[PDB]
Amino acid sequence: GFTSKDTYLSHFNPRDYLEKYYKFGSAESQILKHLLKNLFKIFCLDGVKGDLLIDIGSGPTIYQLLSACESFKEIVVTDYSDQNLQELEKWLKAAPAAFDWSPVVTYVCDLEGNRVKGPEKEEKLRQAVKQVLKCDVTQSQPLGAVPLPPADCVLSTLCLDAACPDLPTYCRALRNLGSLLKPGGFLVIMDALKSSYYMIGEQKFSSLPLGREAVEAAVKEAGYTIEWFEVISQSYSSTMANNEGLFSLVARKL
Ligand SMILES: Nc1ncnc2c1ncn2[C@@H]1O[C@H](CSCC[C@H](N)C(=O)O)[C@@H](O)[C@H]1O
């Protein structure tokens, strides 16, 4: 009764996803602002830094990397959908058909103290991303045959509830992400709470409807220790998703 993974290869329209959720002209923009403030706190204020960050289930978005590129020498972006990776690559290569992230980039520049302007921030992110890879969080080796050094941080925004059909798969996906992380490395997860679907126009996608207690229990079961955990009450618009807020957490792998 859950969206098959192959649906993401064919029916997840990357440009329509960006238009619906990330235009930043709403509930969607309020959630985006909150995610950006937390990402800034984690990568710029807290000590989350290193040589390598792997972003899991990036989709076609780059908002979740704008503060991270200040703290990591390399960022690897990954997703199950090759269409999503191609949309990412249009932005990375600064193609005229790429999505316009400038209002979001400006917002992050403002949060960070106006030390830099938009073009410098975007160039820093483009220089940080060297690999754009296929991933499947449900597999013991999420990156398949591709080898990577153990990462200093694994980040995943709005991916795991969409990717995992049940709670045992969710806990296994957290272990599988841990196989990419060095001992003591950081796990940063942000996702919807209690959502059983989300929409991209008329296309429905399933989501696993977890509450905060089940998320925390799955992270401890998967072998991490949690440093902080935040719940926000703001939910998406009713035409988009049936969540009851969102969570953000930072944990370390044992
Ligand atoms: N098994 C799986 N492994 C990895 N990614 C998966 C997956 N199943 C779905 N996904 C990806 O999960 C993403 C959900 S949308 C989230 C996109 C982006 N990180 C954001 O913050 O908006 C999609 O890009 C989809 O392709």
Ligand SMILES: COc1ccnc(C)c1C
């Ligand atoms: C589970 O809900 C989601 C999953 C992925 N992306 C978005 C934008 C939503 C609302």
